[PDB]
């Protein structure tokens, strides 16, 4: 809700949200846990969350009655609500981690510029980020904006003149309006806190300030209006700090077609044109991706080198290993075709799927090459004779393995139930990958072996 909105107003919106879910989605929604006063972005009377619990997956057939569908209908339906930003969204796969999609930027105050100057430097970066929709999308602050706050100045001279101590003044104000934790008491053999505070109706508006009295040394009661002056000013309802220095968290993601790495590259370039004493750093998912990204090339190199070395020892050749290693694309093309067609993403399940698809296709090739080579070495057969005799012997077991495994992962592809997202990712990439890996290899493996053996007559 807008800045300075009360608890009652937030409840009216949560009631509308709750009413909608138990009216329009009564066949899907089981319960609505309405938490007024809490937000992951920040706390306050002007924030709230509604945790929607659904009926069993068996009682919700088709995509029409799924989270993604309800989310879209909910978000669109709540677009009508006035003076409130109400929208639904699904939970991440791993709730332990955040959304883990986009970047997490920290804007740092490196030279004690103060809150106001850091806000201006943030607004400057946000404005420049908005000028690149082609690269950056939804570049927003994670924290809250400054709000009106009631500044009250206690006149020290007037307090001393009337014989009223500052401790009595600051206690009377703090205790009444703020509340004071005095000491503990025992309720049914359990220690609990004792709180003194003003009854609601006497701590609501600025006019109520003057209804509070403080006793002087001479015993006379003096109202707050006698020794206080008040004005309106703006201040932060939520101040952030990163590595000991004042900060402001900025969330965002790469535009459709762009990588997060390229989106970060620009955010760094935009940040370098900010006022003097305004630094930056990458936190959370961003910090993780940068370190994880540096390792990837070296791990590929080592993996690809040891594969070659192992095959080189197996076959006793520097050349023949290439005949095996050339099958890698035959399996990958099928996975990508199946993924792009069904409308899935390059996720962990898909990536691990490619390695096992590559692994089995490589295994099929290794045995064909081993058989072909052994016929040439031992029985003194020609290249083509040995190759044709090899693929002949290796045809049946490849077809048996492929037929069994493709049917084995069929239910994972067509699955639309609970945890089907993970099953689909596992199934789709493997099925499509295996279909191409099987069909292509049986024709392409003997081509690789013959071409490689013809090229290198070294051994």
């Amino acid at each position: 809700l807008p800045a300075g909105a009360t608890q009652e107003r937030t409840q009216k919106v949560l009631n509308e949200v709750t009413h909608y879910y138990l009216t329009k989605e009564k066949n899907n929604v089981e319960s609505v846990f309405a938490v007024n006063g809490f937000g992951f972005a920040g706390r306050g009377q002007n924030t709230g969350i509604a945790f929607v619990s659904l009926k069993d997956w068996a009682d919700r057939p088709g995509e029409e009655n799924k989270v993604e569908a309800i989310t879209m209908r909910a978000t669109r339906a709540f677009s009508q609500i006035k003076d409130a930003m109400v929208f639904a969204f699904n939970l991440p796969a791993i709730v332990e981690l955040g959304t883990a999609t986009g970047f997490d930027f920290e804007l740092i105050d490196q030279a004690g510029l103060g809150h106001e100057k850091l806000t201006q430097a943030r607004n400057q970066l946000l404005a420049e980020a908005a000028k690149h929709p082609d690269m950056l999308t939804s570049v927003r602050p994670n924290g809250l904006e400054d709000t009106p706050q009631f500044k009250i100045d206690i006149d020290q001279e007037k307090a001393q003149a009337l014989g009223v101590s500052i401790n009595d003044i600051n206690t009377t104000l703090g205790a009444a309006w703020g509340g004071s934790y005095v000491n503990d008491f025992i309720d049914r053999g359990r220690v609990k806190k004792v709180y003194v505070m003003s009854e609601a109706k006497y701590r609501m508006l600025p006019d109520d300030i003057g209804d509070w009295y403080v006793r002087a040394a001479d015993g006379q009661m003096v109202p707050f209006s006698a020794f206080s002056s008040s004005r309106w000013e703006y201040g932060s309802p939520r101040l952030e700090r990163y590595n000991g220095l004042p900060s402001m968290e900025i969330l965002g993601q790469a535009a459709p077609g762009k990588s997060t790495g390229e989106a970060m590259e620009l955010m760094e370039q935009l940040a370098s044109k900010l006022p003097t004493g305004v630094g930056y750093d990458w936190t959370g998912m961003s910090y993780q991706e940068r370190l994880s990204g540096n390792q990837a090339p070296s791990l590929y190199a080592i993996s690809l080198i040891v594969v070659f070395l192992c095959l080189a020892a197996l076959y006793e050749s520097w050349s023949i290993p290439f005949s095996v290693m050339l099958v890698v694309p035959l399996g990958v093309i099928g996975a990508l075709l199946a993924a792009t067609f069904r409308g899935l993403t390059n996720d962990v399940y898909f990536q691990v799927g490619l390695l096992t698809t590559i692994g089995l296709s490589a295994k099929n090739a290794i045995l064909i090459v081993e058989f072909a080579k052994d016929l040439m070495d031992k029985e003194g057969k020609g290249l083509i004779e040995a190759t044709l005799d090899a693929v002949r012997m290796r045809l049946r077991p490849i077809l048996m393995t492929s037929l069994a495994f493709i049917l084995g992962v069929m239910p994972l592809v067509i699955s639309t139930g609970a945890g089907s997202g993970a099953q689909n990712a596992v199934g789709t990439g493997v099925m499509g990958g295996m279909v191409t890996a099987t069909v292509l290899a049986i024709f392409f493996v003997p081509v690789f072996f013959v071409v490689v053996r013809r090229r290198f007559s070294r051994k």
């Binding site: 300075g4 009377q45 706050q149 009250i152 703090g174 703020g178 609601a200």
Partner: protein
């Protein structure tokens, strides 16, 4: 011996003694470090333009550099060769006696008028039905300048004349202590004496310190420069 468990066991017993210690010793902060006796390196800091004094350089290091270096893994202890600034109230006994005041009256006035008060909220929870306004109440905040400390009202006389803190004291930004004063080739300097944490690799820690100092250099004021007058790690790297 595991230095982690050694620190925990020592501190577990220190926390039994802590409450019995004088309030002045607790408020200064007791520390439990697991470091070597000798310094790993000394990170010197000088101003080549000469636009910052030994006291200015010491405050900047303490305020903008020391904490981040102290939090770095492998750094067991950090000794500031200098002192961070404090609001120094230099009392005059002739002026205090003149207005019938004592250091007790000065200490009472500072605590009362340099206060950060929690004043609550307008339309705070639980609220009344029909409340439209919710705003934080801001009372006294910490003083930020010598000027604000200067106009702290100690008392008002019979005739109605005001006695301010600047009438009984000189008020300036000055070091917590004035014990440690450093120089680099006869030039005004401060720095950080860094001790290696028990078991930590000297070269790995030295690299981590250099990486952290590299993130500070860009935002330095004009003239300020890092110098390396003492480092044991280069010998280890070159010797091997």
């Amino acid at each position: 011996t595991d230095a982690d468990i050694a620190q925990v066991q020592v501190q577990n017993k220190l926390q039994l003694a802590m409450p019995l210690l004088p309030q002045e010793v607790q408020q200064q902060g007791v520390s439990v470090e697991k470091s070597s006796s000798s310094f790993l390196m000394v990170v010197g800091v000088i101003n080549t333009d000469g636009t910052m004094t030994q006291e200015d350089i010491s405050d900047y290091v303490a305020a903008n550099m020391k904490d981040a270096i102290s939090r770095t893994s492998g750094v067991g202890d950090v000794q500031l060769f200098g002192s961070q600034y404090a609001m120094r109230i230099w009392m005059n006994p002739n002026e205090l006696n003149k207005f019938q005041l004592t250091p007790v009256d000065v200490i009472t006035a500072i605590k009362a008028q340099n206060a950060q008060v929690a004043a609550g909220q307008l339309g705070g929870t639980p609220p009344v039905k029909g409340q439209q306004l919710n705003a934080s109440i801001i009372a006294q905040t910490r003083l930020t300048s010598t000027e604000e400390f200067g106009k702290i009202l100690l008392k008002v006389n019979q005739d109605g004349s005001r006695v301010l803190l600047r009438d009984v004291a000189k008020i300036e930004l000055g070091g917590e202590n004035y014990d440690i004063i450093a120089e680099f080739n006869g030039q005004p300097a401060s720095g950080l004496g860094i001790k290696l944490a028990t078991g930590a690799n000297a070269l790995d820690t030295a690299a981590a310190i250099r990486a952290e100092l590299a993130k500070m250099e860009p935002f330095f004021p004009s003239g300020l420069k890092i110098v390396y007058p003492y480092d044991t790690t280069p010998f280890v790297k070159i010797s091997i």
